[PDB]
Amino acid sequence: SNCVADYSVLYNSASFSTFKCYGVSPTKLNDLCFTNVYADSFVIRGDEV
């Protein structure tokens, strides 16, 4: 919270094997603003993704 983020930096990174989104389209993020971010992080099997 209480910061700015250029999501297009993430978008333009080819390193991500998927960039799927379910309630916003990943171009529009740079024009939006939010109350909480909630980032969650983990390691799993590739078949589990």
């Binding site: 250029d6 603003c33 109350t35 971010v37 980032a39 799993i44």
Partner: protein
């Protein structure tokens, strides 16, 4: 293979905005019809004080 995974889980509550994507703000306009974006609650109208 193992995979690194991240989930970003934005909260769109009716509450003070606290993280934004980068878009540059501009001067306030009074008594003119304008498209407006305060904090992502975007609309169109006459912004009267």
């Amino acid at each position: 293979q193992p995979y690194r995974v991240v989930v970003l889980s934005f909260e769109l509550l009716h509450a003070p905005a606290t993280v934004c994507g980068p878009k540059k703000s501009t001067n306030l306009v009074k008594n003119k019809c304008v498209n407006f974006n305060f904090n992502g609650l975007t609309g169109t109208g006459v912004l009267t004080e």
